[PDB]
Design a protein around this ligand. Structure first.
Ligand code: ZN
Lengths: 96, 220, 59, 60, 49, 107
RNA sequence: ACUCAACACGGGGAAACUCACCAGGUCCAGACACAAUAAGGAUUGACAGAUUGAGAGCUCUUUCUUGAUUUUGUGGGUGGUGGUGCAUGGCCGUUCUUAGUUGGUGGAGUGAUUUGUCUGCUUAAUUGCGAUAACGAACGAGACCUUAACCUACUAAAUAGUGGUGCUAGCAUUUGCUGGUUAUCCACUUCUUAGAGGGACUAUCGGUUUCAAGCCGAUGGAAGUUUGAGGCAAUAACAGGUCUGUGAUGCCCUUAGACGUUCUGGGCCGCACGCGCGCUACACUGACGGAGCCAGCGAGUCUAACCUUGGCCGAGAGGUCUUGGUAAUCUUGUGAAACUCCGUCGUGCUGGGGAUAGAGCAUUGUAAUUAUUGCUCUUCAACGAGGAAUUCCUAGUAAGCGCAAGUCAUCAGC
């Protein structure tokens, strides 16, 4: 899908920060709840990461639940040029 | 918000969670969930069999759930706190057995071995009765419904709600979809809470053997 | 206008139309065989007792 | 109609065998006895038991 | 790519399955009648009489 | 400031009668133990939420209906107590599935 | 979907949506991998006309904008209210809510199997008595659970209610009688609420039978038809229904000029006619006008326009200014309808009946035309108790009668 580089980067940054993203299955929603981008871009960005193994998706009650995988952490680290050290929120003492 | 609306919304919150974890914690052997609403926090307890690798890695792939929970339902980080908990009586959990049936049927243990396998595992561990029904396509085109009953179980009345634990799962495969039905009666003697018998079960105590005749034989 | 429905092929409902039928082999390969019942049933107690050993060793 | 099931008629015979000494030909005292000596879960069944128990005691 | 969707069956869909038909709105449920009977006891609606 | 006696309404709402009676009993007993002025647990009429659906997911069969009920039990207890004791009473009686609201009576 | 077990059923009351159908137009929301193509721009965009229902840069005119996302092929996905319910899951309907089902030990039989599980009487009941090569049991029935009827007995309560008092208004003198002031206040908990417990077991007596199970009469009692009503409901089955509830699903079909999706308009309502559920009627036990005037179950908005009181405007529908209510508190005593009284008519298609139809004024909504709906006047049809047939029904029941809820922006003959 054709997507602005800015919006794509915002989604990748969010996903790396939190390690999870929750998107309602609404392609017409003008703005995503947690990210300043169109909800369509979130769903289609993460669909492209899931097809490559980088993100695991679960779908329930018209919501997509995305969880970042180990391979996805590495990919996003390279893509964002982040310098080992900085992990995602899912490595900060999870417990739930 | 009204109380009529609020308690219903807490019902739908539970129901959304139960269905979420069912498909998320499929491999990790999810029994169920309970929630305890306090003023500050909201406690949650994921009961599960495989409680080792649900947690793991000093937490690396676990709170994904809570971050997913806090994200959707609009909770702060400090409020909601889940817990992993070792499930008690793996046999009597009807959900666990129908889930275990799936994994046996996936790696290709044949129906009768799988069914009799699970029935005997239940019936050993304290269970007054059991049932397993498997329905659907299995290699033949026409579909059929085999039953694998053992022991004793009632069917009608309020005791069903009390004792017997129903659970169902849908299992995917090359040819069609097959469907499982694990009733497990549990013994009223091992109650914990509630009544300790069936309503029909009358019990009589035997009288002590009293000696006839006797004398006055007074005391002071 | 007056002519009612002309059935809905209910007179030959039990008689299959495909023409294909299931052999005894296909049924038995899916749903297990009645001759080889002991082999299946004896392996169940082995599979059952395997899990009970793992359940016990959790002190 | 009023026809009593097995569990009524069975447990009535089972009480009378053990406690024909004790019990009377009167419902009210019997029902209060059936609480102590027998362990019945239900309240309605207890009143059924004790009622047939009284019917048999009348015949004896 | 969009038109009025403020009222009517086009607006309201099921929480679970995204069907417009046969909704239960009472008490702000928004669950289709079929899905309700599945998730009735889970919510806390139990049969009695 | 702490010793100022405030008139307070504790409202208890639950679907489960047993838990709600236990919590209600514990609040009343604790109020007695501290010699607080109590108006006892007023039982409000139980709200029966009723949903009637067709049993069948399709058009077929006899027109059979199912009726589901959710019962909401509501109680309130009025207490005259200082602020410190009230905070103590509310914290001790948190049972899962009982909702507890505290309203300060300002006229 | 087509006998019971299709046909006011799909919670199916479709103005758009819903939506699947029809005439037309967009968008790709075409994952990924590989190559092509390639930053001396792969490729999105868009004013004004042209074009088109259209302010859709869709396409065309034209010359900017953008900086590798993609486009273009090749595999391969994704979605599908596309097909098959005769490939399936789940669910539900039916047989059957009928009374039915099974094994242990013993007996009979080489065996499959059988008896138990029965001639009779009894029960709502394979419920029991009794008969008895069976004996003792289990599932189903029953018990249970929810609900409805009693409990001057307990437990308490202004978010329920009463009795004096504080208070205050009128009638009347006799203190009174009848009302305001919901915490000015005190005391109770009968009525009301719901929490524990009690109460019924065919109790007790009289008949009539294998003097058994039972049944029938009479008296107490709140209640004596399983106390009334449901819920749950065995072994099984059916090529019952549902792939148009589902991100339940196999396979097949389709996949950029789409059977994906979305926008505009139409259609689902279209009318020589045949059938099913219903509403309103045919009048005098009635219509009409005034007056009297009594329920129960409900439901209801916080960042949303929900239930609406009271005042004011209006013939009415409605409008309008404020207020209570997240609700035993406010709406609401839901002063519902039939009915009750006193009037008006007088047996005539009549003042019974209110179809069809004209004109106007409101309301909801982006939109009311193929009348959404309501209101005013006018128009005033068939129908004089329904042929052959055929449905439902045994006590607070049938039938009459309206009300709330569901759906719901609006619309009930359901
Ligand atoms: Zn749904």
């Amino acid at each position: 899908m054709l997507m602005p580089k800015e919006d794509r980067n915002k989604i990748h940054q969010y996903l790396f920060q939190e390690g999870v993203v929750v998107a309602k299955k609404d392609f017409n929603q003008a703005k995503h709840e947690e990210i300043d981008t169109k909800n369509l871009y979130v769903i289609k960005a993460l669909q492209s990461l899931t097809s490559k193994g980088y993100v695991k998706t679960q779908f329930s009650w018209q919501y997509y639940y995305y969880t970042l995988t180990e391979e996805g952490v590495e990919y996003l680290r390279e893509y964002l040029n982040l310098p080992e050290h900085i992990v995602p929120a899912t490595y900060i003492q999870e417990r739930n | 918000i009204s109380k009529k609306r609020k308690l219903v919304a807490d019902g739908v919150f539970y129901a959304e969670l139960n269905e979420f974890f069912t498909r998320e914690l499929a491999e990790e052997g999810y029994s169920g969930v309970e929630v305890r609403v306090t003023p500050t926090k909201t406690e949650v307890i994921i009961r599960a069999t495989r409680t080792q690798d649900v947690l793991g890695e000093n937490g690396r792939r676990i709170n994904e759930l809570t971050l997913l929970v806090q994200k959707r339902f609009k909770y702060a980080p400090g409020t909601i706190v889940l817990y992993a908990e070792r499930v008690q009586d793996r046999g009597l959990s009807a959900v666990a057995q129908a889930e275990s049936m799936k994994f046996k049927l996936l790696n290709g243990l044949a129906i009768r071995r799988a069914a009799y396998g699970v029935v005997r595992y239940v019936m050993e561990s304290g269970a007054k009765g059991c049932e397993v029904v498997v329905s659907g396509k299995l290699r033949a085109a026409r579909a059929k419904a085999m039953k694998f009953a053992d022991g004793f179980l009632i069917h009608s009345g309020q005791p069903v709600n009390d004792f017997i634990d129903t659970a169902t799962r849908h299992v995917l495969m090359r040819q069609g979809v097959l469907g499982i039905k694990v009733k497990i009666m549990r013994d009223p003697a091992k109650s914990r809470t509630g009544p300790k018998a069936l309503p029909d079960a009358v019990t009589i105590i035997e009288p002590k053997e009293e000696e006839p005749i006797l004398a006055p034989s007074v005391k002071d | 206008a007056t002519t009612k429905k002309s059935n809905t092929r209910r007179a030959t409902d039990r008689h299959s139309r495909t023409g294909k039928t299931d052999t005894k082999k296909k049924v038995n390969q899916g749903w297990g065989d009645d001759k080889k019942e002991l082999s299946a049933e004896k392996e169940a107690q082995a599979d059952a007792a395997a899990e009970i050993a793992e359940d016990a060793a959790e002190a | 109609g009023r026809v009593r099931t097995k569990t009524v008629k069975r447990a009535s015979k089972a009480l009378i065998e053990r406690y024909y000494p004790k019990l009377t030909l009167d419902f009210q005292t019997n029902k209060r006895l059936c609480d102590e000596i027998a362990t019945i879960q239900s309240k309605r069944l207890r009143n059924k038991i004790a009622g047939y128990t009284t019917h048999l005691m009348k015949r004896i | 790519f969009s038109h009025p969707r403020r009222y009517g069956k086009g607006s309201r869909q099921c929480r679970v399955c995204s069907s417009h038909t046969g909704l239960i709105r009472k008490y702000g449920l928004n669950i289709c009648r079929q899905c309700f009977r599945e998730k009735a006891n889970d919510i806390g609606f139990n049969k009695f009489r | 400031q702490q010793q100022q006696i405030i008139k307070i309404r504790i409202t208890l709402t639950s679907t489960k009668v047993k838990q709600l009676e236990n919590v209600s009993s514990n609040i009343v007993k604790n109020a007695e133990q501290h010699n607080l002025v109590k108006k006892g647990p007023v039982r409000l009429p139980t709200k029966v939420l009723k949903i009637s659906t067709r049993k069948t997911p399709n058009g077929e069969g006899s027109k059979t209906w199912e009726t589901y009920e959710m019962r909401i039990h509501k109680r309130y207890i009025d207490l005259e107590a200082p602020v410190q004791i009230v905070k103590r009473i509310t914290q001790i009686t948190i049972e899962p599935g009982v909702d507890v609201e505290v309203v300060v009576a300002s006229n």
